CSV table of C-alpha atoms in Angstrom, one decimal:
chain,number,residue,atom,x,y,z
A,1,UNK,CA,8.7,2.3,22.6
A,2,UNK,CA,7.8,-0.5,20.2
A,3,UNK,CA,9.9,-4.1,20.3
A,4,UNK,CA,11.7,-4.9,16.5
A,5,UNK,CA,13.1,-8.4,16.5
A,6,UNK,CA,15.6,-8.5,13.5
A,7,UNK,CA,16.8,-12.3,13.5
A,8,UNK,CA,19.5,-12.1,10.8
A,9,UNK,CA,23.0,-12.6,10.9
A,10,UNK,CA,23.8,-8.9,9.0
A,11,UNK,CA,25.4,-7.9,12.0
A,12,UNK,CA,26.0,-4.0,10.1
A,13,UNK,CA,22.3,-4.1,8.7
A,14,UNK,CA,21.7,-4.3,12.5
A,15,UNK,CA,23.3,-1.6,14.1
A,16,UNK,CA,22.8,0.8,10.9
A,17,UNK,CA,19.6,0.4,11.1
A,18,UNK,CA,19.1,0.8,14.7
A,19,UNK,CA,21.0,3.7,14.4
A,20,UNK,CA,18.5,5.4,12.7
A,21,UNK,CA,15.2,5.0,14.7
A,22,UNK,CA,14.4,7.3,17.8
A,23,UNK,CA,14.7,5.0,20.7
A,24,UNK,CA,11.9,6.5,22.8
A,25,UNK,CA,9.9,5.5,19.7
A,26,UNK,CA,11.3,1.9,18.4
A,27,UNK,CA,13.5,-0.9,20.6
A,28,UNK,CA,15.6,-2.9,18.2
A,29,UNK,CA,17.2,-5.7,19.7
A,30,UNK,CA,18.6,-8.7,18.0
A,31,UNK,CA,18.1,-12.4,17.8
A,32,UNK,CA,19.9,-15.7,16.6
A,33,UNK,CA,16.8,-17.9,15.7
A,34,UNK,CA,13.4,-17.8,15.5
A,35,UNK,CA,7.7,-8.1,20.2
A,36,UNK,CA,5.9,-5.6,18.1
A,37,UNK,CA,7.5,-6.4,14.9
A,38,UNK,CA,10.1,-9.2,13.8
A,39,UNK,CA,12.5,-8.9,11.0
A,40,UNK,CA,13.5,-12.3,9.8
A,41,UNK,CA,16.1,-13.8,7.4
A,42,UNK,CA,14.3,-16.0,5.2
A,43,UNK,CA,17.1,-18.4,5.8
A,44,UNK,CA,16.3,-18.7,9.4
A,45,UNK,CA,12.7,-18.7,8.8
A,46,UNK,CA,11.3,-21.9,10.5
A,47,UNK,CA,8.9,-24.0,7.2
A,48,UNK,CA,6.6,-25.4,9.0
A,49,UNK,CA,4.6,-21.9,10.0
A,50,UNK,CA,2.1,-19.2,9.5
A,51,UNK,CA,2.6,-15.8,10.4
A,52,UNK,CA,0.2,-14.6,13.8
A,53,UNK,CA,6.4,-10.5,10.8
A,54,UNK,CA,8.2,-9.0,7.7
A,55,UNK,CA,10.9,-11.4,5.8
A,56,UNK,CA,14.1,-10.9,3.5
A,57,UNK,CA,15.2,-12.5,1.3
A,58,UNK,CA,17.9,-12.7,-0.9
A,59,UNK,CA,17.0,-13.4,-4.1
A,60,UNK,CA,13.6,-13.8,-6.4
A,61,UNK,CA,12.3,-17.1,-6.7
A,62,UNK,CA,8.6,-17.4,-7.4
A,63,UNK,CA,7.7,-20.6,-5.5
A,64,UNK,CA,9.1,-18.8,-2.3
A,65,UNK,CA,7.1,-15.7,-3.3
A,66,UNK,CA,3.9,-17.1,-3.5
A,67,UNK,CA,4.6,-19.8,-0.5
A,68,UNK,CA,5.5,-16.5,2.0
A,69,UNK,CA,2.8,-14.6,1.1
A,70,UNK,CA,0.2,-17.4,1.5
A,71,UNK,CA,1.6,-17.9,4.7
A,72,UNK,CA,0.8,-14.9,5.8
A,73,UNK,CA,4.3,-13.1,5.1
A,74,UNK,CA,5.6,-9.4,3.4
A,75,UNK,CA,8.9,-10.0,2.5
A,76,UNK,CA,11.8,-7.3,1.0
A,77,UNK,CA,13.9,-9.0,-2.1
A,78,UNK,CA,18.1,-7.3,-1.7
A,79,UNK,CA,19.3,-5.3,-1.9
A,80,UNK,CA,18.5,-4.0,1.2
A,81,UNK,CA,19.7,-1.2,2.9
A,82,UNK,CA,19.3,0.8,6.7
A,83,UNK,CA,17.3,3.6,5.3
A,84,UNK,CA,14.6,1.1,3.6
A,85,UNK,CA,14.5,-1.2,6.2
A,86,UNK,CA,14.0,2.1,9.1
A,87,UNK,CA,11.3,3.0,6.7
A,88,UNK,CA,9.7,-0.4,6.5
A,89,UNK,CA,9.8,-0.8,10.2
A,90,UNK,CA,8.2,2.5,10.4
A,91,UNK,CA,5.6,2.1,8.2
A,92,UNK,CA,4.5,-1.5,9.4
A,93,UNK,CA,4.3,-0.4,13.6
A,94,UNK,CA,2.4,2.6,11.9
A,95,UNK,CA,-0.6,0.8,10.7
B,1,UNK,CA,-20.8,-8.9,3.2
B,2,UNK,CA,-20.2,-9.4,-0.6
B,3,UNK,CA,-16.7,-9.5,-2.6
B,4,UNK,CA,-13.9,-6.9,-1.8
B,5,UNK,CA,-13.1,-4.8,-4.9
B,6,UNK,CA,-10.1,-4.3,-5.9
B,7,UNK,CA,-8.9,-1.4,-8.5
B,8,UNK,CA,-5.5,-2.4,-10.7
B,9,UNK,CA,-4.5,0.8,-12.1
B,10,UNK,CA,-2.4,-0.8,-14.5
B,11,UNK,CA,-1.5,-0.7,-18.7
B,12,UNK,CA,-1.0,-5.0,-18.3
B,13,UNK,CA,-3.8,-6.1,-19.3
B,14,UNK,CA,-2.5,-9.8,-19.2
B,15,UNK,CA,-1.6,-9.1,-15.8
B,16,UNK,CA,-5.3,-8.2,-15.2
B,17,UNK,CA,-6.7,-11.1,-16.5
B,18,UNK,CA,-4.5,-13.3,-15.5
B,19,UNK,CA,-5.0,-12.3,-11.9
B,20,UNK,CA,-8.4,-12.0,-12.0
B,21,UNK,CA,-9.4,-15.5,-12.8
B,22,UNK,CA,-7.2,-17.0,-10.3
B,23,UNK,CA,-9.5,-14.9,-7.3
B,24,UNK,CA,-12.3,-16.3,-5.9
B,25,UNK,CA,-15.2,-13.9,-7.4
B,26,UNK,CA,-17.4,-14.3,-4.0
B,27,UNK,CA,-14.3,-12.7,-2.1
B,28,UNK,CA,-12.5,-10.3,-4.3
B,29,UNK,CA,-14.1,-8.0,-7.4
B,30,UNK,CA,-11.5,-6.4,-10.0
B,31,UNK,CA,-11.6,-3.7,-12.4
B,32,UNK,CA,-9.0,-1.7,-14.4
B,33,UNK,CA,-8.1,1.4,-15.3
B,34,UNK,CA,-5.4,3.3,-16.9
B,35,UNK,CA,-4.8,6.4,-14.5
B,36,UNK,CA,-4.8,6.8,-10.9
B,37,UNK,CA,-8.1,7.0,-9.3
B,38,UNK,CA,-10.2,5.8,-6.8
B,39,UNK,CA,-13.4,4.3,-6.6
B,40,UNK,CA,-16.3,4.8,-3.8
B,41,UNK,CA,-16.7,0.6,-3.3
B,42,UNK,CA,-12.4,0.5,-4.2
B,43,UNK,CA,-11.0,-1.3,-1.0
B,44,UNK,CA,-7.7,-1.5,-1.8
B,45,UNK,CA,-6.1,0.3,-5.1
B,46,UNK,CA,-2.9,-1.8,-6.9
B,47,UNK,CA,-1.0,0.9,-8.8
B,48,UNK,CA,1.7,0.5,-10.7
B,49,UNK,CA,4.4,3.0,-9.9
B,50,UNK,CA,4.7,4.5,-13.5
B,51,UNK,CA,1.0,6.0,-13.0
B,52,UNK,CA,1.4,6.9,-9.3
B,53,UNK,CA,1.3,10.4,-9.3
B,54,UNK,CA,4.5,11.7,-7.1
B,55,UNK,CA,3.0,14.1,-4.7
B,56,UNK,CA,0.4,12.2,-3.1
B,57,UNK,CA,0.5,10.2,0.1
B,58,UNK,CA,-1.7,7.5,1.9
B,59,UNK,CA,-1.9,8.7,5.4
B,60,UNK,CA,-1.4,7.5,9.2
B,61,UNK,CA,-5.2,8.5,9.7
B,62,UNK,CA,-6.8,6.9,6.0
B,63,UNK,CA,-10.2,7.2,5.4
B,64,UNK,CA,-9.9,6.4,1.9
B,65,UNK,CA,-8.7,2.9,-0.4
B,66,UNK,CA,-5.4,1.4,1.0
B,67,UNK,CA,-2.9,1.2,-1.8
B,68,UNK,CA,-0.2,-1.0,-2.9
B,69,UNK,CA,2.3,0.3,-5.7
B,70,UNK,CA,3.6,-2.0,-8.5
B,71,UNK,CA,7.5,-1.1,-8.9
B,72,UNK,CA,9.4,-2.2,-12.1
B,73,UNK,CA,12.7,-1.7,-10.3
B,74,UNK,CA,15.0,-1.7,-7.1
B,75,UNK,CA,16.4,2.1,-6.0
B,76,UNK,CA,16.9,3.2,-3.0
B,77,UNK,CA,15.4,6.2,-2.5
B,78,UNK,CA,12.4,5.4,-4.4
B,79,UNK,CA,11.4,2.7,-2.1
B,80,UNK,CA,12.3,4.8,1.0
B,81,UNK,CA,10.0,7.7,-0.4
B,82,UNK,CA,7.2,5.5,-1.2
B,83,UNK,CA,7.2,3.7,2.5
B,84,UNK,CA,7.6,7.5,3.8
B,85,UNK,CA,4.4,8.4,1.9
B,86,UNK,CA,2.7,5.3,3.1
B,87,UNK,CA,2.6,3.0,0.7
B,88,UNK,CA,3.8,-0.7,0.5
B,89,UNK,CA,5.2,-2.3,-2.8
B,90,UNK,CA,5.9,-5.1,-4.8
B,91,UNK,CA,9.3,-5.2,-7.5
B,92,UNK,CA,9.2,-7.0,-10.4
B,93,UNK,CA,8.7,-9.7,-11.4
B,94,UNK,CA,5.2,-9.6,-10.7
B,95,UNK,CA,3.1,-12.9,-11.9
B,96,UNK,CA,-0.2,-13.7,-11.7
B,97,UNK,CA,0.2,-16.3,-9.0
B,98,UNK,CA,2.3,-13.5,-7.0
B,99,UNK,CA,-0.3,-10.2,-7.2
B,100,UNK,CA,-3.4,-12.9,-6.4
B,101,UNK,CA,-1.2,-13.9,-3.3
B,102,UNK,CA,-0.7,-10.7,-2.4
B,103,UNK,CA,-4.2,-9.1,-3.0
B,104,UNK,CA,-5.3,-11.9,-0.5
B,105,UNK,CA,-2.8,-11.4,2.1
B,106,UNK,CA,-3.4,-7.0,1.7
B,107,UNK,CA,-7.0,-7.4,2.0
B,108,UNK,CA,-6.6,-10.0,5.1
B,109,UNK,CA,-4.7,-7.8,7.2
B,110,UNK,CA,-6.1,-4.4,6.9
C-alpha cells in the first residue's frame, strides 16, 4: 500500500477522499506542516524549496504558476473535489 | 542526445510562438498541428482538450508520446475522466511563461 501525505487543513477533503481509495492499495494519512506521494496546501508549502509532491491552490495567480512549476511542482487550481483528487492521487503513484 | 520534441496540437498560434521562443532550442523542438496526432520523434504531445478525441486513453504500460491536455475550463467529471484515461492537464489561463514551465517540468520527470 502506497503512503499519501495530504498536509492541508480541509479536514472533509481528507476523509472524503480517503474514503474513496482501496486501502490495501493507497495509505492516506494526514499531516499539519510540511511517503510515496504528498498532497500539500500551497499555503503551507515551505518558499525556500525544490520538489525531490502535487500542490493546491486556491486561486490562479501567474507568478505562483510559473514559480511552482519551476520548482519542480504540479499543482490543482479549486475547486477541488474527493473524486478529482482520488483520481490525481491515482494517476501520479501510477506512473 | 539532441532536443526533445514536443508536438502542440493546438488552433493558438500565438500560444505557439510565444512558447516556442522562450525554450531553449538545444533542449526542446516544437511543431504544430491542428488535429490530434502523433509523431515518431514526438516525446511528449500538448493537446488542447477541444481536439482530444474522447475515446482514447494513454496507458499504465505507454510505449507511445506522453500527453498533456490543454483544458479551457473547470468540471468535474471532465477532469476525473481525463486523469482516469491517463492524462494530466492544465486549465486556463494558459500563458506562454506557464506552458514553457510546464513543458520543462513534463519532459524532466518522465
Amino acid at each position: 500500500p502506497k503512503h499519501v501525505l495530504l498536509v492541508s487543513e480541509h479536514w472533509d477533503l481528507f476523509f472524503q477522499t480517503k474514503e474513496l481509495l482501496n486501502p490495501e492499495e493507497y495509505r492516506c494519512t494526514i499531516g499539519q506542516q510540511y511517503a510515496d506521494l504528498v498532497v500539500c496546501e500551497y499555503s503551507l508549502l515551505p518558499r525556500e524549496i525544490r520538489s525531490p509532491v502535487l500542490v493546491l491552490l486556491d486561486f490562479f495567480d501567474e507568478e505562483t504558476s510559473v514559480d511552482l512549476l519551476d520548482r519542480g511542482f504540479w499543482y490543482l487550481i479549486r475547486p477541488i473535489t474527493p473524486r478529482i483528487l482520488k483520481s490525481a492521487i491515482s494517476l501520479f503513484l501510477s506512473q
